[PDB]
RNA sequence: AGGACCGAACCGACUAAUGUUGAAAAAUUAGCGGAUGACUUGUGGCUGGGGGUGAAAGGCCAAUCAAACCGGGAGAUAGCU
RNA sequence: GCUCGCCGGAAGACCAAGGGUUCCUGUCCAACGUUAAUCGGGGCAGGGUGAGUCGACCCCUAAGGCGAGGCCGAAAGGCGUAGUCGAUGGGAAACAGGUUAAUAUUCCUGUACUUGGUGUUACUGCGAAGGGGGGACGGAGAAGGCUAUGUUGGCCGGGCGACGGUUGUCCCGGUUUAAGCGUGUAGGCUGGUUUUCCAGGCAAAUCCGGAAAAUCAAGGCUGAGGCGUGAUGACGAGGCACUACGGUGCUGAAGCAACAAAUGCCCUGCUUCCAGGAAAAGCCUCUAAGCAUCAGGUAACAUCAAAUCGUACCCCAAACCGACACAGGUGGUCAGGUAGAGAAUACCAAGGCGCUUGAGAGAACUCGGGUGAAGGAACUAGGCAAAAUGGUGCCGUAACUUCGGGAGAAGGCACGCUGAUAUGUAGGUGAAGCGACUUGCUCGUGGAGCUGAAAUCAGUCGAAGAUACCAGCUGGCUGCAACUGUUUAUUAAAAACACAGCACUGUGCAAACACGAAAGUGGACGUAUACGGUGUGACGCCUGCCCGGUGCCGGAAGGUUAAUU
C-alpha cells in the first residue's frame, strides 16, 4: 500500500512510499537476466541527445516475454517480483513442460494462479488471445500492433485499453491517452490491466530520490544567457517572448506529429 | 639441440667484479657476460659444452647501460657529446661440483 | 597546487604515440611534415 | 531509519591578518562548512570550437575563453599614432 | 662521541604512478649547492638489480576502440556485423631464517607447493565454435566466535646503586618461531537417496528444468580459529677465544600462562531496506558429428619443463607535477605505550630528523604572541579583531510547531586524592575437581586465578580537582529562500541555480525530440501511471477579470495568390 513517512528529517517529511509485501525479496531468476549498461543520454557520436539523464542505480535487464507465444501450455505464477526497468511488476511463471518466463503482472495475479496463451484460452486475466477471440468491451493490456511482433500498448503500471468495436479484420481500441486506434484483429492482447496501480501515488520527497533514479537537474531556460537558450537574459526576471524549446520550436500548444504513413489508423485523436 | 654456432656466439666474457669472485668462492657459481638475446637454456648448453663443466641452474639479469659523455675533436673543435652505454646480459651459472678456471 | 601536466605513459602513447599517428590520414600527414622538417624525435614514442 | 546530529581522515572555501619584486603566477596562520551522501577518490574511456560540457556563472574546455591552440590566406586593412 | 631539541595516524616504514642510475664504493671541489665545504642527489672511475611461485607477458572480459564482408556518403570518409583488441575487474602455485658496501618470497639453509609434456602399469566411453551449473557481485545495521596485538604475572639472565633508602612482594632485559601437511569446530547454507515419466534447454543428453511414487530426514557443502607436526631445527638476552676490536668468530638460558583486544578474519555470511545491485574465461558436468578391443579419459609412479621482460633507488618528496634543493599538489598499505570515546589531542617508543648563511646587539617601526589599573562598545560603516563559552552525569527547560521539533533551549549542582562498604564490589573471563555423553575441538555443575567499572559514607590538600592540550557564547524581534545540496578554478557562495511538489503542452511508437548532407544512434531493449519541452518552486489558504494586440489551436464559404499550361 501507500505509506507516509514520519517527518524525522527534511527530505523524509514528504516522501510517500508504495510497499508491496508480496514482492519476492531475493535474487532474480538468473537465466533471464543480462547486463544493461547506462548511456547518460549520449548517442554513438558521444553527444547528449536527450538531456537530464545520468547517474542512478545500477540495474540489470530482465528478459520479459512480451510475445506470449507458448500456446496451449498452462503456466502457474511462481512469484511476483520487482523490476527496476519498468513501472510495473513482473511475474515469474512456470510452463509445466519445465520452462520459466517473465510476464507483466496483471492486477489480480498472485502466486499459484494459472495462465494460458492461445486461441482456446479462457477469458480470465493473464491469458493472452488474438483480439478476434476476445469479447468486445473487455479491457486488455500488452497489446500487439503488428501480429507476431509483441506487445507495445498498455505496458505501464496501471494501464489498459478497451476493445470498443470489431470491424471485420480490424478492432478499435480506446488507448489510455484517449485516442481511438485501429489495429488488425490477429494481434494479441492479455486480459486485465497492469498490476502496480498504486505507482502514481508515490512522492519522491527529495532531490536525491530523483537523482538515484537517473534524472539530472533541469535548468530553466529563462535562467540562462541569450547564447544558451532563446529565453535569454535581461537583468531581473524578464521573459517577453513566446515559450519555445531550446531549439526555437514553439512549445505550449504547437502540434508536432507528422506521420502520414500511419495516420489512416487513427480514427480519433486524443482529447 | 641448439646448434654449435649459437653456442659459440652466446658466451661473450667472464665478468670479474668482486661480487663475482665471492660468488665463485662461496656458492660455486661463475658470473659471465652473455649475448643480450641469450636464453637460460642457451647459456646452460654453451657453458656445458664449451667449458666441459656440469651446471645446475642459470640466473640472468639485464644490465642497463649508463650514460657517459666526453669530447671529440672532429672539425678541430672539441664538441661535448653524450651517449648511452650498451645494455648487456649477466649470467650467474651454478656449477655442481666441477671447476674450470 | 595541482598543475595541468599529470604524466601517464599509457595515456601519452595512446594519445600521441606512433600508432595513434599512423591510424588516421591526418596523423600520417603530421608524421610526413615532421619527416620533412628533419625532426630527430618523430613522436612521443621514445 | 535518516540527502538526521556532534566531530577527525577526506572534500571544501565564510572571516581576518600576513604575503603583494611572495615560501606561492591564489598560498600560509587562526578560526569556518559538509563529513553515509544529489558524497568523495584511483585507473581507463567518451564528447572538439559557432562546437562540446554546464544544479547556469558567459562558467569550464592544458596558468589562455562573449568563440581554444597551432599552421596557413598574410606583408589582411589601418583616412590613426 | 656525549648532551639538548623536533616529529611519531609522521617529518617513521613499504609500494603504485612518475622519474630514470639519483643506489654503493673510491676519488676531486672549477662550476652547481642561495654562505664555507674536506661534504653532496655536483664532476670523474668502478661496482650493483639473480624468480616455475612477486609483477608484467599470458587466458578472459567491462566502458570503449578498430573492424573482413556490409550499409551509407562529392572525395576524404561515417557507422557497424562476424571478429579482434581493451583493466581500473575474474583465471595457478613459497614460507621462515641467514647473507652484500650495494639484490632478495629472486642468492644460501631447511621445509614446501602448482601446472603442463612424455613414458610404464592398472582400470575405462571418449569426443565440441553446442547445453546446463558455477564464477557472480548492492546499501546499511547488529551480534557472536576469533586472531594480529598489547598488559600483567610466572620463568630465565643480569643488578644491589656518584645523594637519604633500596635482598625485596625491588630494578633492567628476554620470554620469538612461518608456509605446508594433518585434524575439522564457533558459525552459515541446504532435507537426502532411489525408480518412472516429459509439449522446455534451436538437436540430444544418462546433465539442468518439470511431474509423480517409495523410503529414510540421523546426509552433504562451507568454514575462521584452536591443537598436532613442521621444529632433538631456527632464533635467542648475554657471555667467551679472537680481533684493524671496525667488527668478525664460537657458544648460548628461559622460551610459559592469564587477561584485554581490533576498523583485520569467520563474512561473497546473517538481518533488513529500496534506489533492486558487471561480463567472459579458467573450473564441474551433459551429450552431437566423429572414433572403436584404436584414439582419448581416470589413477599411481617415474622423468622433463616452467621460457621472456621487471627487480637498484626516490616515491607526501631535494629523484614525481609546480622554471628552483620551491612553506604548494600527489593514490594504496602498515597502525606500538600512557591518558582519551577516538585514526582528535598531549607526552613518548621503533625509526627519523634540527628544515645549507651564520655571529652579535637588545633603538624606532612592522610581524607573531603574553599580561594589564579604573571603565566596559564610549570603537567602528559594522563588536571587524580579540576576549569569552566549551566535558561527563543528574535535575530542569518557554513562546511557537508541519507534532518530528524548538532543545545542549535557557539555568543549575557534582567532579581531585585517600580509606572503608569490598585486604577488589556489581559485572566480565574462567582453571582444577567431580559428573555425564550420541566418549573429546564433550556437556552439566563448580569456583581457583585474572580483570574490573559505578556509587555511597568518612577524611584530606590547594586560590582553583572537565585544573594542561582538547572543548558550544547565549537570548529577543524581523527581510529573503522551505529544507540537504550547486555556482562566477584566481576579488561575488548569495536572496542567485537546483530541488521534491504543481500546472500547461507535445508524443500512439519506425513516438515526439536530439546528434547526423546519409546510414544509423540516443529517447528505450521504455510505450501515455511513459517520455520530451516550458514555467512555477516544500507545505498551508488561495490563484479574481480581459481573447481587443501578438502567438498557438480549429474551420473553409468567399477575396487574393506560385510554379505549371
DSSP H or E segment with residue B93: strand B88-95
Cα A143 to chain centroid distance, Å, stands at: 12
From residue B44, how far is each of A201, B7, C5 by CA, in Å? 80, 9, 48
Indicate if CB(A30) is under 7 A from strand D.
no
Residue C28 CA, nucleotide E360 C1', distance (Å): 71
Q: Strand E nucleotides below 7 A of a protein CB?
A: 17-19, 21, 44-52, 62-66, 76-77, 79-80, 87, 100-102, 106-108, 132-134, 136-137, 198-201, 209-211, 273-279, 305-311, 320-322, 328-330, 402-404, 482-484, 496-501, 504-516, 520-523, 525-539, 550-554
Beta strands per DSSP E along chain A:
2-4, 16-18, 33-35, 60-62, 75-81, 90-95, 99-104, 114-115, 128-130, 139-141, 143-144, 151-153, 161-167, 170-174, 180-184, 188-191, 266-268
CA of A1 to C1' of E553 (A): 41
Architecture of domain A195-271: Irregular (4.10)
Q: Are B24 and B38 in contact (CB under 8 A)?
A: no
The helix/strand/coil state of A197 is: helix
Q: Kindly determine whether the C-beta of residue C3 is less than 7 Å away from any atom of nucleic acid strand D.
A: yes
Decide: residue B23, CB within 10 A, 0-12 exposed, 13-18 middle, 19+ buried.
Answer: middle
3-class DSSP state for residue A268? strand
Breaks (C–N over 2.5 Å) after residues, chain B? none
- Distance, in Å, from the CA atom of A114 to the CA atom of A123, rounded to the nearest integer, reads 12
Distances (CA, A) of A25 to A30, A99, C13: 14, 22, 49
Q: Where are chain A's structural domains?
A: 1-113, 117-194, 195-271
Chain B touching partners, 3 or more CB pairs below 8 A: none
User: Which grid cell is A117?
Assistant: 496463451
Cα A247 to Cα A242: distance, rounded to the nearest angstrom: 13
- State the DSSP string of A12-68: TSS-EEE--TTS--S---GGGEEE----TTB-TTS-BSSSSB------EEE----S-
> At what resolution in Å was this solved?
2.6
Rounded to whole angstroms, the Cα distance separating A229 from A245 reads 8
What are φ and ψ of residue B24, in 5° steps?
Answer: -60, -45
Q: Are A55 and A214 in contact (CB under 8 A)?
A: yes
Report how far residue C13's alpha carbon sits from residue C23's, in angstroms, rounded to the nearest whole number: 13
Residues 50-109 in A having a C-beta less than 7 A from any atom of strand D are 51, 54
- Domain of B88, in residue numbers: 1-101
The nucleotide minimizing the C1' distance to residue A23's CA is E276
DSSP state of A136: T
Domain A1-113 has CATH 2.40.50.140: yes
Q: How far is the CA of A13 from the C1' of E483 (A)?
A: 10
Does any strand D atom come closer than 7 Å to the Cβ of A203? no
Sheet holding B29-34, edge to edge: B11-14, B29-34, B88-95, B55-63
Radius of gyration of chain C (CA): 12
What contacts A75, CB < 8 A, 6 or more positions away? A93, A94, A95, A96, A101, A114, A115, A116
Count up the domains in chain B and report the number.
Answer: 1
From the list B75, B98, B90, the residue with the least C-alpha distance to B20 is B90
- Write out the residue range of the structural domain in which residue C32 sits: 1-46
Query: Experimental technique used?
Result: cryo-EM
Tell me if domain A1-113 and domain A195-271 are identical in fold: no
A225 CA to D81 C1' distance (Å): 39
The answer to whether the C-beta of A174 is closer than 7 A to strand D is no
Angle made by CA atoms A147, A260, A188, in degrees to the nearest 5: 15
- Asked if residue A114 lies in contact with residue A127, where contact means CB atoms within 8 angstroms, the answer is no
For residue A109, CA distances in Å to A77, A84, A199, A238, B85 come to 8, 19, 17, 54, 81
Amino acid at each position: 500500500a501507500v505509506v507516509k513517512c514520519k517527518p524525522t528529517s527534511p527530505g523524509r517529511r514528504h516522501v510517500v512510499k508504495v510497499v508491496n509485501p508480496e514482492l519476492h525479496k531475493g535474487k532474480p531468476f538468473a537465466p533471464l537476466l543480462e547486463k544493461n549498461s547506462k548511456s547518460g543520454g549520449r548517442n554513438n557520436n558521444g553527444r547528449i541527445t536527450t538531456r537530464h539523464i545520468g547517474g542512478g542505480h545500477k540495474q540489470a535487464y530482465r528478459i520479459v516475454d512480451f510475445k506470449r507465444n507458448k500456446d496451449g501450455i498452462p503456466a502457474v505464477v511462481e512469484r511476483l517480483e520487482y523490476d527496476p526497468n519498468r513501472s510495473a511488476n513482473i511475474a515469474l511463471v512456470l510452463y509445466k513442460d519445465g520452462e520459466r518466463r517473465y510476464i507483466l503482472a496483471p492486477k489480480g495475479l498472485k502466486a499459484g494462479d494459472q495462465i494460458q496463451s492461445g486461441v482456446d484460452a479462457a477469458i480470465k486475466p493473464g491469458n493472452t488471445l488474438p483480439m478476434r477471440n476476445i469479447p468486445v468491451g473487455s479491457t486488455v493490456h500488452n497489446v500487439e500492433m503488428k501480429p507476431g511482433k509483441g506487445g507495445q500498448l498498455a505496458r505501464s503500471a496501471g494501464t489498459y485499453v478497451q476493445i470498443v468495436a470489431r470491424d471485420g479484420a480490424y478492432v478499435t481500441l480506446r488507448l489510455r491517452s484517449g485516442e481511438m486506434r485501429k489495429v488488425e484483429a490477429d494481434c494479441r492482447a492479455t486480459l486485465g490491466e497492469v498490476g502496480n496501480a498504486e505507482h502514481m501515488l508515490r512522492v519522491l520527497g527529495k532531490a536525491g530520490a530523483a537523482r538515484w533514479r537517473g534524472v539530472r537537474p533541469t535548468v530553466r531556460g529563462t535562467a540562462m544567457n541569450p547564447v544558451d537558450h532563446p529565453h535569454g537574459g535581461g537583468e531581473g526576471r524578464n521573459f517577453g517572448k513566446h515559450p519555445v524549446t531550446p531549439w526555437g520550436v514553439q512549445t505550449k500548444g504547437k502540434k508536432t506529429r507528422s506521420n502520414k504513413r500511419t495516420d489512416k489508423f487513427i480514427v480519433r485523436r486524443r482529447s | 639441440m641448439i646448434r654449435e654456432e649459437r653456442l659459440l656466439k652466446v658466451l661473450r666474457a667472464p665478468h670479474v667484479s668482486e661480487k663475482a669472485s665471492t660468488a665463485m668462492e662461496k656458492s660455486n657459481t661463475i658470473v659471465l657476460k652473455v649475448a643480450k638475446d641469450a636464453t637460460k637454456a642457451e647459456i646452460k648448453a654453451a657453458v656445458q659444452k664449451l667449458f666441459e663443466v656440469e651446471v645446475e641452474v642459470v640466473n640472468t639479469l639485464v644490465v642497463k647501460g649508463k650514460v657517459r659523455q666526453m669530447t671529440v675533436r672532429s672539425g678541430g673543435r672539441v664538441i661535448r657529446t653524450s651517449g648511452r652505454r650498451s645494455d648487456w646480459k649477466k649470467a650467474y651459472v651454478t656449477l655442481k661440483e666441477g671447476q674450470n678456471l | 597546487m595541482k598543475r595541468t601536466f599529470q604524466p601517464s605513459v599509457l595515456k601519452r602513447n595512446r594519445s600521441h604515440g606512433f600508432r595513434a599517428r599512423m591510424a588516421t590520414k591526418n596523423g600520417r600527414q603530421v608524421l610526413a611534415r615532421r619527416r620533412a622538417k628533419g625532426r630527430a624525435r618523430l613522436t612521443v614514442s621514445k
